[PDB]
Short mmCIF file of C-alpha atoms and ligand atoms in Angstrom, two decimals:
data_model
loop_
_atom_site.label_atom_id
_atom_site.label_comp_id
_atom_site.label_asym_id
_atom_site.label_seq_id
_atom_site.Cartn_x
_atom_site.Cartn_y
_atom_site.Cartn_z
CA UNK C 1 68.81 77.93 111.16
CA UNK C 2 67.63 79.59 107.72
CA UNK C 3 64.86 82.40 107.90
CA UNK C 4 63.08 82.63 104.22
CA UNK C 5 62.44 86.02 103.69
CA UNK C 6 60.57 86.62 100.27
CA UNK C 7 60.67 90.13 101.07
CA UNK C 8 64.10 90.99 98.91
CA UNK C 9 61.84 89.56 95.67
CA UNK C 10 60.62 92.94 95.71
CA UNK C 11 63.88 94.58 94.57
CA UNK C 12 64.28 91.97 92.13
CA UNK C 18 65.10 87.37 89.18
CA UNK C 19 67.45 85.58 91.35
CA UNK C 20 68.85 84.40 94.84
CA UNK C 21 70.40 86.42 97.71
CA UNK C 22 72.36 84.83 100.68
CA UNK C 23 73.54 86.09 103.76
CA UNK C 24 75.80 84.51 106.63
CA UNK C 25 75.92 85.83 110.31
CA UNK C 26 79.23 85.10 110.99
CA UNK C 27 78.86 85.47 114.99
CA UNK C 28 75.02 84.43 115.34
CA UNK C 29 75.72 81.81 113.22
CA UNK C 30 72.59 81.89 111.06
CA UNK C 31 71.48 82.10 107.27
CA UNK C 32 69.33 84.09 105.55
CA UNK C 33 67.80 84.29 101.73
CA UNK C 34 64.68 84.55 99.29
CA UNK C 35 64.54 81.87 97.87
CA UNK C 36 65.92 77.93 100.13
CA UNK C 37 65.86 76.29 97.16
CA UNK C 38 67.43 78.29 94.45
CA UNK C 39 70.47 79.19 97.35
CA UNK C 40 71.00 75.46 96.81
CA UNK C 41 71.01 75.38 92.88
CA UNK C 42 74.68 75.15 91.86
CA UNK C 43 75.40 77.39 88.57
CA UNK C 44 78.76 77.95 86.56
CA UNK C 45 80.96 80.10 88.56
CA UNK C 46 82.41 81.57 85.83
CA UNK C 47 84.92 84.65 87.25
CA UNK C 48 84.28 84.12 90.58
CA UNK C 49 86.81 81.34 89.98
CA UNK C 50 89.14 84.13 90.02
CA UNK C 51 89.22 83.27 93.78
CA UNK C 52 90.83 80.25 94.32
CA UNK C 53 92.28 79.71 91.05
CA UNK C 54 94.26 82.99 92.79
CA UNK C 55 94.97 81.12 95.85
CA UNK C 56 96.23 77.91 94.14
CA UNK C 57 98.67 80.01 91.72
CA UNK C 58 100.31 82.11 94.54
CA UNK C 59 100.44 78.63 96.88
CA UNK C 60 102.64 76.63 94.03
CA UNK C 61 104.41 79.56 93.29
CA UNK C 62 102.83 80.45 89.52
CA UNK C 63 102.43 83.51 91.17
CA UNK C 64 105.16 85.21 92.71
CA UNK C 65 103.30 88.04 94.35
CA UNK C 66 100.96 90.80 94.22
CA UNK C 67 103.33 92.82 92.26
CA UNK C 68 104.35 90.56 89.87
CA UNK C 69 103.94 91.73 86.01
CA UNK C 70 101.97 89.94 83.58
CA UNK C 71 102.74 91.53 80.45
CA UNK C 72 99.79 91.88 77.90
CA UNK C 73 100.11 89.69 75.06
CA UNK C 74 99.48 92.42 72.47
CA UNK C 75 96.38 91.38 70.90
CA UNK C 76 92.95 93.22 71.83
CA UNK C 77 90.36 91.51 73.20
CA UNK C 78 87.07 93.30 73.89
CA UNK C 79 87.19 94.76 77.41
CA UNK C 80 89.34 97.17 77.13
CA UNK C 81 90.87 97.64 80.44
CA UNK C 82 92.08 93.85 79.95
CA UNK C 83 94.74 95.58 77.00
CA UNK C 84 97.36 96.68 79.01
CA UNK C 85 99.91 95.05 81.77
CA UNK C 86 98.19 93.54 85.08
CA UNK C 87 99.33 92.39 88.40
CA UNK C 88 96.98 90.51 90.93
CA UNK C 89 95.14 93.20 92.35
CA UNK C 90 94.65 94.75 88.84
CA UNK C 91 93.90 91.64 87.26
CA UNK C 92 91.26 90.85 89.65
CA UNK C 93 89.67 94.00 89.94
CA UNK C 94 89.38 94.15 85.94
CA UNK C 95 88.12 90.42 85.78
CA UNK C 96 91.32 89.37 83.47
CA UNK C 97 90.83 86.22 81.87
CA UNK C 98 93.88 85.67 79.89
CA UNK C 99 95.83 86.59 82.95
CA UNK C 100 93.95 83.60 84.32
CA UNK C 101 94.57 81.06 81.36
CA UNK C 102 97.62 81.32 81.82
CA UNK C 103 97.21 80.51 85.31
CA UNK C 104 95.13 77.62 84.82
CA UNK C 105 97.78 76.00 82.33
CA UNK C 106 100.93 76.41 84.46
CA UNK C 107 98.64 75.14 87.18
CA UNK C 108 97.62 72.21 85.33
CA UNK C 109 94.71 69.91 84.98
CA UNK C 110 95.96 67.29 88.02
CA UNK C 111 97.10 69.99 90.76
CA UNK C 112 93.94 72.16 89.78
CA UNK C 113 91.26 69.48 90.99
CA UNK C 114 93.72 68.21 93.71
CA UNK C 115 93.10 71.78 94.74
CA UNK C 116 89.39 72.01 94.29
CA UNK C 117 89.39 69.03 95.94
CA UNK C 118 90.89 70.22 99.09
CA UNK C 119 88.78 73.40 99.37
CA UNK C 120 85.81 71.51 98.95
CA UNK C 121 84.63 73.50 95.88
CA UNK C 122 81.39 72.72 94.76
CA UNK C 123 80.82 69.97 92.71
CA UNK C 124 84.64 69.56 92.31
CA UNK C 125 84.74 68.72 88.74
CA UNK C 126 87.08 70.00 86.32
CA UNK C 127 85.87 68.81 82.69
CA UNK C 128 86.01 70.71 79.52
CA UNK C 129 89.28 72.93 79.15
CA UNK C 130 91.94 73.90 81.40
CA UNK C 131 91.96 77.25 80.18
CA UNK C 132 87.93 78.02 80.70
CA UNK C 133 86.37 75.12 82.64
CA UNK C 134 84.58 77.85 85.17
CA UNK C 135 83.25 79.47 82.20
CA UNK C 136 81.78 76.17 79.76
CA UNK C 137 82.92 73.08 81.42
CA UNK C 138 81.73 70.89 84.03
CA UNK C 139 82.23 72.98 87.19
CA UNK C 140 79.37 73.77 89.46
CA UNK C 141 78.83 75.65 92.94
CA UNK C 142 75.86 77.18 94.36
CA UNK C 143 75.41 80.68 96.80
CA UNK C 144 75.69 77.72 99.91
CA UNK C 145 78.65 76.54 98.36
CA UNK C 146 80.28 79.94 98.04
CA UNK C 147 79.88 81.22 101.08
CA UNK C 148 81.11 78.19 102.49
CA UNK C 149 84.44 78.72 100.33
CA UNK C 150 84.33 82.20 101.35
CA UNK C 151 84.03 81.15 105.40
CA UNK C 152 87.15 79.35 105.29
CA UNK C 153 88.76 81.91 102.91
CA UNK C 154 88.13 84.49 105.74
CA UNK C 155 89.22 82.34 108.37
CA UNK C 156 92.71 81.13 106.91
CA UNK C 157 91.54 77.89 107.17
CA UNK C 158 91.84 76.45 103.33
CA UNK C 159 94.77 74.03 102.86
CA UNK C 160 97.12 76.81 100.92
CA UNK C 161 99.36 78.81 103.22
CA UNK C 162 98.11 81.39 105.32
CA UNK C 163 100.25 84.21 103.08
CA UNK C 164 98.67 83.15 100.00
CA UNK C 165 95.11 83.51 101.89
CA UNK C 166 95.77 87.09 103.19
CA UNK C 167 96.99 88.50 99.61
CA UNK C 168 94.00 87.34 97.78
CA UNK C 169 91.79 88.89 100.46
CA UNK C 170 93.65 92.13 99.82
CA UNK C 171 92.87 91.45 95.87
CA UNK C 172 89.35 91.23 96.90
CA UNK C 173 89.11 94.15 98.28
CA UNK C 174 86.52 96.45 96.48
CA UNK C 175 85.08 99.02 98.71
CA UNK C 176 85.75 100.56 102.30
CA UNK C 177 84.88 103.67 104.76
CA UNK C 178 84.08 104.35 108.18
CA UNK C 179 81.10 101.96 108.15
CA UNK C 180 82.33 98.45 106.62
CA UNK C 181 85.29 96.45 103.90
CA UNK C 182 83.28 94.84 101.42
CA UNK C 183 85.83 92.09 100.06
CA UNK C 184 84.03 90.28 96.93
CA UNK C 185 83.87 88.95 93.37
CA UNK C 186 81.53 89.49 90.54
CA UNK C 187 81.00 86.98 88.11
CA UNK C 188 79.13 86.84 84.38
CA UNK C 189 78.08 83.48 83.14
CA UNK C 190 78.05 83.34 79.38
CA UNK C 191 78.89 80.48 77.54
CA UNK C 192 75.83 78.30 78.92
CA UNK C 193 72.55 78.43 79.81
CA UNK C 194 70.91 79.78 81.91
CA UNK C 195 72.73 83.32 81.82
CA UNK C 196 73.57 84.25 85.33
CA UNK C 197 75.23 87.59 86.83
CA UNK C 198 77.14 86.45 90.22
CA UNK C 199 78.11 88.86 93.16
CA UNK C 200 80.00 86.73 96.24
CA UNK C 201 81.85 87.91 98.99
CA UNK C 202 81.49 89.46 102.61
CA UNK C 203 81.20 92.43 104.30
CA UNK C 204 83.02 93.31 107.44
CA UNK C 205 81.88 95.51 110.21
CA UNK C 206 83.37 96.60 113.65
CA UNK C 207 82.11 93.47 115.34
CA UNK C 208 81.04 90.85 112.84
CA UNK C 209 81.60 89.83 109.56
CA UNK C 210 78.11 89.26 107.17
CA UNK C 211 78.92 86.55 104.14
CA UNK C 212 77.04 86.83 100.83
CA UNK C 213 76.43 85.36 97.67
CA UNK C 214 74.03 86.17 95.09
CA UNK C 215 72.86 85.51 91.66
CA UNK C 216 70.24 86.62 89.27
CA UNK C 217 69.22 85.50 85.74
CA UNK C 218 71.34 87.52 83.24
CA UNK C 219 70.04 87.72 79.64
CA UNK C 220 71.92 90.73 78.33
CA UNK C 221 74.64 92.51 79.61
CA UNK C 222 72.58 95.37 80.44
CA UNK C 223 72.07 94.58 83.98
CA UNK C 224 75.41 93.73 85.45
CA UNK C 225 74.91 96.73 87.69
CA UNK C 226 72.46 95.21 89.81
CA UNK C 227 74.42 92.51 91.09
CA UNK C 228 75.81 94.89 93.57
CA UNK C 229 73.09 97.32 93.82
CA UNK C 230 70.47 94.70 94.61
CA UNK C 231 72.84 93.08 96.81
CA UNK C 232 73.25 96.17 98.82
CA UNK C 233 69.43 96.89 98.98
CA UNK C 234 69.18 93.70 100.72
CA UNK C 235 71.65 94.81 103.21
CA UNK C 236 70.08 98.09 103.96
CA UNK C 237 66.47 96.26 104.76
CA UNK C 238 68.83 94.25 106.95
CA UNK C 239 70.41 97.30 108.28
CA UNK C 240 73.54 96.27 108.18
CA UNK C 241 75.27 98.69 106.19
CA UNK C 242 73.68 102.54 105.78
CA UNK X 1 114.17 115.76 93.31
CA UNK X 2 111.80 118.39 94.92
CA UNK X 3 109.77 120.44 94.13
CA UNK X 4 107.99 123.48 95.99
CA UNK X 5 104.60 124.37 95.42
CA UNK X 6 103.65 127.40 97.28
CA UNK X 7 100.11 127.46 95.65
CA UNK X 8 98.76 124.19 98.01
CA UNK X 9 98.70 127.15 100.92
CA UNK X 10 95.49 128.41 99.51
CA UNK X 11 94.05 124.89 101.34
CA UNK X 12 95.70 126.06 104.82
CA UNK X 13 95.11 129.95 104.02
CA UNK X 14 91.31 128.94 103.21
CA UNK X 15 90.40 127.85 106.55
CA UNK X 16 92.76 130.23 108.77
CA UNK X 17 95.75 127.36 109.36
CA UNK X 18 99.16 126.56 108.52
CA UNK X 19 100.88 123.08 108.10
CA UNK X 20 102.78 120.82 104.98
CA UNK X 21 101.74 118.36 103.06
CA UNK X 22 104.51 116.42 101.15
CA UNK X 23 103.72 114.35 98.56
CA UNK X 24 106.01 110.71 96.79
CA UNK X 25 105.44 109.68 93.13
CA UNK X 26 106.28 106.37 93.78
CA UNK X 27 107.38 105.43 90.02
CA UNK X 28 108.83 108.78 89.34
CA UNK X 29 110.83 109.02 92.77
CA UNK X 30 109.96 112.83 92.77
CA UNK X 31 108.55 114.10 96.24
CA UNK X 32 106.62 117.41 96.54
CA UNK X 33 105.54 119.57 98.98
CA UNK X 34 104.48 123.52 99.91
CA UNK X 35 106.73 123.50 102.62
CA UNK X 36 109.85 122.69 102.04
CA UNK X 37 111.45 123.49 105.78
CA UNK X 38 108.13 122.41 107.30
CA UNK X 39 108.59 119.29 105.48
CA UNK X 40 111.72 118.74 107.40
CA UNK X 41 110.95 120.14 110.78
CA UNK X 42 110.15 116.93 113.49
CA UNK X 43 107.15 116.18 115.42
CA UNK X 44 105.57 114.39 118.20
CA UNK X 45 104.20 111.10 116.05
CA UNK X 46 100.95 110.57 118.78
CA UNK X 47 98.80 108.27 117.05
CA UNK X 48 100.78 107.63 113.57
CA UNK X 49 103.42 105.97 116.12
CA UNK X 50 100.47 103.44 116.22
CA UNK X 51 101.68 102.05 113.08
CA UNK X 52 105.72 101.06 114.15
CA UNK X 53 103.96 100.04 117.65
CA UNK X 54 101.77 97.98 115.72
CA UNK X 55 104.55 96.34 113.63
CA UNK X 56 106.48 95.47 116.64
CA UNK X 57 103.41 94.01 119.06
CA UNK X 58 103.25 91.43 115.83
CA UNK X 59 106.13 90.51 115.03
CA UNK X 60 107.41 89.80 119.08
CA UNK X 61 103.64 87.87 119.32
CA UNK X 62 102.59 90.18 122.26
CA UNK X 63 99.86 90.63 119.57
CA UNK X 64 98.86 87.52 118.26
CA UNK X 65 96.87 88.18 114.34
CA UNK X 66 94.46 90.96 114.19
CA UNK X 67 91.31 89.03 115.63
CA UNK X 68 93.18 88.64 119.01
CA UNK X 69 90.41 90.58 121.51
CA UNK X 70 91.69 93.10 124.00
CA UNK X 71 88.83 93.92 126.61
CA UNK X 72 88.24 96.82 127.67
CA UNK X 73 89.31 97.36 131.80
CA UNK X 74 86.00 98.96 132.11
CA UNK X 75 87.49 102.32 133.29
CA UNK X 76 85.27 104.65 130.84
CA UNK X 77 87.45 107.16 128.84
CA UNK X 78 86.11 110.57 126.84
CA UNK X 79 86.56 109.11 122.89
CA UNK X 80 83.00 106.94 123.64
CA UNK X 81 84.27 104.24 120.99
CA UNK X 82 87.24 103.27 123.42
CA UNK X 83 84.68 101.90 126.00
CA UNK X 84 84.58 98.96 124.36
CA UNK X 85 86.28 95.71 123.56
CA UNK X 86 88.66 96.04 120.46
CA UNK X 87 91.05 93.78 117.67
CA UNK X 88 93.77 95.38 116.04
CA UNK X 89 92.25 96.50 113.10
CA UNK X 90 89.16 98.63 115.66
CA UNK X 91 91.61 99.73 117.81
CA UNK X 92 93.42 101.10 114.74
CA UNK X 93 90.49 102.46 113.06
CA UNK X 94 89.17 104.09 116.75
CA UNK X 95 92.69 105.14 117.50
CA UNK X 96 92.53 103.24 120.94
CA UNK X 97 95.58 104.57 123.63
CA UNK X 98 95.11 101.89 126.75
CA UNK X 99 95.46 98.96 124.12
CA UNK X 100 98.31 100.18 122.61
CA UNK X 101 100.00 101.30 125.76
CA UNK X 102 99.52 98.02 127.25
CA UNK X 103 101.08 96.70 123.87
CA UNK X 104 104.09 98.98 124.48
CA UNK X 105 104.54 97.61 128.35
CA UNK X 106 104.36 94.35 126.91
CA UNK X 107 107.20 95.16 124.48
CA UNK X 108 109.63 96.74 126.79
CA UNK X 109 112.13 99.81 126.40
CA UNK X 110 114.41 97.50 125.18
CA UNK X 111 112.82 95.57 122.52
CA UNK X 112 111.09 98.90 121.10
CA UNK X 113 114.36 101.30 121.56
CA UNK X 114 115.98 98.58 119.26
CA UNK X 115 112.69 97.82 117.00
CA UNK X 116 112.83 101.24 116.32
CA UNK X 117 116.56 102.12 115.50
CA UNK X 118 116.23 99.00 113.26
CA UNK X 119 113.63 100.76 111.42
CA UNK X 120 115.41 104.27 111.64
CA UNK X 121 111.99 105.53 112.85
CA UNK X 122 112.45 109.23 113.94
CA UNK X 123 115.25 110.46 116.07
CA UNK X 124 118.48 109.43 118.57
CA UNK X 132 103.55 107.03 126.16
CA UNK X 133 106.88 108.66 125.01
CA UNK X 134 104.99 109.15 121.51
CA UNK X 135 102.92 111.37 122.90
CA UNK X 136 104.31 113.82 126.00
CA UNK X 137 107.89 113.19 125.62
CA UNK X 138 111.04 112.00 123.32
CA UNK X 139 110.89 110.72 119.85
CA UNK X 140 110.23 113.40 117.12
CA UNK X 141 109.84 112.57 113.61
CA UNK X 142 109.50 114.82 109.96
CA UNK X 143 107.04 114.21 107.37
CA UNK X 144 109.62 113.24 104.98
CA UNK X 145 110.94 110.79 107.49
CA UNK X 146 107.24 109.55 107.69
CA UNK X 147 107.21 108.97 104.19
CA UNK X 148 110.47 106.88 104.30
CA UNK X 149 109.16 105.01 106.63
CA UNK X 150 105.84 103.72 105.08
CA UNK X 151 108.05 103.18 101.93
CA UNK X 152 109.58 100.46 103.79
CA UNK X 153 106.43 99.06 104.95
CA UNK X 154 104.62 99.57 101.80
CA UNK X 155 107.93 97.51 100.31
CA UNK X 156 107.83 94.56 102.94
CA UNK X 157 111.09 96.10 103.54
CA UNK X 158 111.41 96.65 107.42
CA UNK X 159 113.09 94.37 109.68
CA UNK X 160 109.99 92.27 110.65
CA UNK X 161 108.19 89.26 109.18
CA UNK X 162 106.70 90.12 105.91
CA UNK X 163 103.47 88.58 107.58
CA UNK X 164 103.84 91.31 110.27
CA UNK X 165 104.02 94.08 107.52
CA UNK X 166 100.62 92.49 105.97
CA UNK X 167 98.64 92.89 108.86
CA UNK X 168 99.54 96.36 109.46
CA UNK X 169 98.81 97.31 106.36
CA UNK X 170 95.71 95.52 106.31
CA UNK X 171 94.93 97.38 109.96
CA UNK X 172 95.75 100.71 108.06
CA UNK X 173 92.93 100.81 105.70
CA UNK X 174 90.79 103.70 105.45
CA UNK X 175 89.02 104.12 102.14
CA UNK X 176 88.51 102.04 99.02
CA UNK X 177 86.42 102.80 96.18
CA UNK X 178 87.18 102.17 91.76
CA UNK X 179 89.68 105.06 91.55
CA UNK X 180 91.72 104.41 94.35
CA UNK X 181 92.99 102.51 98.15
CA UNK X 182 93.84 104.32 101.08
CA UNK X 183 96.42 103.19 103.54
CA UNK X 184 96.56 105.52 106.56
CA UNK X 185 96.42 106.75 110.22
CA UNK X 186 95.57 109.99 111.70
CA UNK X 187 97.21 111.46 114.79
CA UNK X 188 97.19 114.30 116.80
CA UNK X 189 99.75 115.85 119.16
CA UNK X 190 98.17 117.63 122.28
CA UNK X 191 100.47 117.62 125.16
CA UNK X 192 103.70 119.54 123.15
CA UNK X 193 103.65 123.05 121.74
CA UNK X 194 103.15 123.23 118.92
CA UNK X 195 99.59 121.31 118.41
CA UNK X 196 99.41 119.54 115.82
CA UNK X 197 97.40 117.18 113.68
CA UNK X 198 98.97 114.49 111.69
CA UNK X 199 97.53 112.58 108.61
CA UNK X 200 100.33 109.79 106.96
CA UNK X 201 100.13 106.88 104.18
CA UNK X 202 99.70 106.03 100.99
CA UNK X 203 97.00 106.29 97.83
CA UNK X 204 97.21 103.14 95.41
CA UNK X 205 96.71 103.55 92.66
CA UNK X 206 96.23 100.60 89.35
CA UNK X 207 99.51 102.07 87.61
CA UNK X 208 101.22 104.25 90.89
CA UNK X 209 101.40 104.74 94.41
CA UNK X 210 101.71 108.29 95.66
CA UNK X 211 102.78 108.37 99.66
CA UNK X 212 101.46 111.23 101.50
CA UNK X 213 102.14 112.83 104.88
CA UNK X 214 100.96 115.69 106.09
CA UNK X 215 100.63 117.79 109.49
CA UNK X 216 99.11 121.02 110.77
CA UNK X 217 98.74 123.64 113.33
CA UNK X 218 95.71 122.20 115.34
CA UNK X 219 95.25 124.20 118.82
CA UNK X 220 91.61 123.34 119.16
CA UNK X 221 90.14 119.52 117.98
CA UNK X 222 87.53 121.55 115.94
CA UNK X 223 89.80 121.51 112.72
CA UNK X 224 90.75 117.83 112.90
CA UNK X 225 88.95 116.85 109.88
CA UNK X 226 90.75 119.39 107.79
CA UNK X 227 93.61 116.75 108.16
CA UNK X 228 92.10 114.75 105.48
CA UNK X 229 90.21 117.24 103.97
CA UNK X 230 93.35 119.52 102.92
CA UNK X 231 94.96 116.29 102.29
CA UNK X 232 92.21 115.52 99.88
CA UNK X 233 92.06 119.11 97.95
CA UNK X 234 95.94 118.18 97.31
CA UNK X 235 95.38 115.29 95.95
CA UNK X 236 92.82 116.68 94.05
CA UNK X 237 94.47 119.71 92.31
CA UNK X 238 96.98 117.35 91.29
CA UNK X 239 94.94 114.94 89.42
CA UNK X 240 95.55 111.70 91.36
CA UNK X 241 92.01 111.43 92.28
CA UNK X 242 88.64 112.96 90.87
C1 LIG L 1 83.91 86.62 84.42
O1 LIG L 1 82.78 86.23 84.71
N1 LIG L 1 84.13 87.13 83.21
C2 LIG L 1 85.30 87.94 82.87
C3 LIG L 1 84.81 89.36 82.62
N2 LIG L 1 84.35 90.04 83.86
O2 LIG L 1 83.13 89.64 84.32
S1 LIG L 1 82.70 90.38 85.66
O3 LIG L 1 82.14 91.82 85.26
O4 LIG L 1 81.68 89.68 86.39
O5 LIG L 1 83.82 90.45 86.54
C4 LIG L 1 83.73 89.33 81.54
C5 LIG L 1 82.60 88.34 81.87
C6 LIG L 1 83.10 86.94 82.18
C7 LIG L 1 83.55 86.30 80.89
N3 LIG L 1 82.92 86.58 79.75
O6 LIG L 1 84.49 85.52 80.90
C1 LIG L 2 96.40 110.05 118.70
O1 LIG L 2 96.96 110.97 118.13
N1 LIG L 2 95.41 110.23 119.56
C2 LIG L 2 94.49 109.22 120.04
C3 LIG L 2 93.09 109.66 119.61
N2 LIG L 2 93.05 109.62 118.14
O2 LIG L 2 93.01 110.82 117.56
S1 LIG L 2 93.25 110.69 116.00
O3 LIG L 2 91.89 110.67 115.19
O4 LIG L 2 93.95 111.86 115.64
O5 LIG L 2 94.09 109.61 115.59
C4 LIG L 2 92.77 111.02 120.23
C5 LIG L 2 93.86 112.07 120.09
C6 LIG L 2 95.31 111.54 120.21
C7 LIG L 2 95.74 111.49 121.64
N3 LIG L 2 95.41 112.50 122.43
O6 LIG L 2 96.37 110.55 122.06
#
């Protein structure tokens, strides 16, 4: 079951979605827009992580990608990355790169296997999440992220348990949140993405959410209207 | 290299205690410390020897991954958060004894004695009333190894240790790292070990301290922390 719970409009536009891992049950604002599949944008960086350390484009978290030398706008993307930097800075060209020595035939083999959203790979290698043909919705994400935490996509195990560690983005004495934000851009309609989980001493608590994103001014509240839903919910202070 | 830095004191001297803290730039391979015999004197382990026992339950499978659930016997301890059922990373985080003395049974003297000489882990519930002793820089080597995948056990086994150890995340920086503390042994202790990640470093850290009472135990990371502090590698 799905409780609707128009409550969280309040600190709102957009959708959020929460999993009970151990009860088993959803919970969101808004049934219908939890179903509408957007661009994922940079939460690709998830599995398009997990398909380049399973074939091996990726040697490990410590490999060195060396920056190109040319500087792009975001300025923590000018300098060297490895996975867990590149991922916690949102590197694109890291990810190009990734995408190409992937390739176009082994990337939607992939997506096929994980069952990732609308599974389609059109537009070009190099930025399909971003202005291509590739769609998922909150649903759809959590669903990814469900297996993801469970070990249970078709890449090995290894591969799983290193880009968890690249997700990680916060943790103290009260929960691991393990997540990726995302920006749409390129198309319509502009969309801010925060998807993830949050674990706790004796369950784990899925999420995805979006909101409409017309300027870059309000990237912030991805994660700070996410976490107001989950203090309502009391599950984190 | 190493270096002593008598002026860290002030952060023992400032709360009436005594105790090192040694301290490994990773890319530098400089160590330093305020202590330097201190740094080199060996201790009881207690509850940091949860991280070798924790290594060695995994790799043997008497621990399976770190969802495997270990009941609780129902026999109701004095730490409140015991009294309960526990995986590997809870019964890391809670510091939980009866699970990981039934995960030392399960290994044997034999498999551990060897486990551990294999990992040149301290010296030739023993961790905590009786025989192995380890230093602070030995600590340090130690979780070098680990942070390295670089110990004799699966690489998988090293990854969910690692993953167990977590303590604090945030922008600036990961935290790898268990606390301990040594009660049954003159002298009492308390024990804080592991690592700070950094995006461009890693800086290992292990630290103990004089600790005849459990009202100072938070000073562990506390002290720890004003170290890290006065040396710029966190805010
Ligand atoms: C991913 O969506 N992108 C890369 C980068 N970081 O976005 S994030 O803050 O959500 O991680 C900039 C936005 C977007 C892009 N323009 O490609
Ligand atoms: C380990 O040193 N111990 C288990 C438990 N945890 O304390 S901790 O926060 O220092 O790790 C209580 C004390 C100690 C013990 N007596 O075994």
């Amino acid at each position: 079951e799905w409780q609707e719970n128009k409550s969280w409009n309040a600190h709102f536009q957009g959708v959020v979605v929460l999993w009970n891992e151990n009860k088993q049950q959803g919970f969101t604002n808004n049934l219908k827009r939890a179903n509408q599949a957007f661009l994922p944008a940079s939460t690709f960086k998830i599995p398009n992580s997990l398909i380049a350390l399973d074939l091996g484009v990726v040697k490990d978290e410590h490999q060195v990608f060396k920056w190109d030398g040319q500087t792009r706008d975001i300025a923590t993307w000018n300098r060297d990355h490895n996975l867990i930097t590149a991922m916690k800075y949102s590197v694109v060209p890291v990810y190009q790169e990734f995408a190409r020595q992937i390739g176009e035939a082994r990337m939607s083999k992939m997506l096929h296997a994980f069952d990732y959203g609308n599974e389609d790979i059109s537009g070009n290698v190099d930025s399909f999440w971003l202005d291509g043909g590739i769609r998922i919705s909150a649903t759809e994400q959590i669903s990814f992220l469900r297996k993801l935490y469970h070990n249970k996509l078709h890449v090995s195990e290894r591969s799983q348990r290193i880009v968890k560690q690249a997700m990680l983005t916060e943790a103290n004495g009260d929960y691991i949140i393990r997540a990726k934000t995302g920006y749409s851009t390129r198309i319509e309609p502009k969309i801010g993405w925060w998807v993830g989980w949050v674990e706790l001493d004796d369950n784990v608590w899925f999420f995805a959410m979006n909101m409409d994103m017309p300027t870059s001014d309000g990237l912030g509240l991805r994660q700070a209207i996410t976490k107001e839903v989950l203090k309502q919910e009391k599950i984190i202070p």
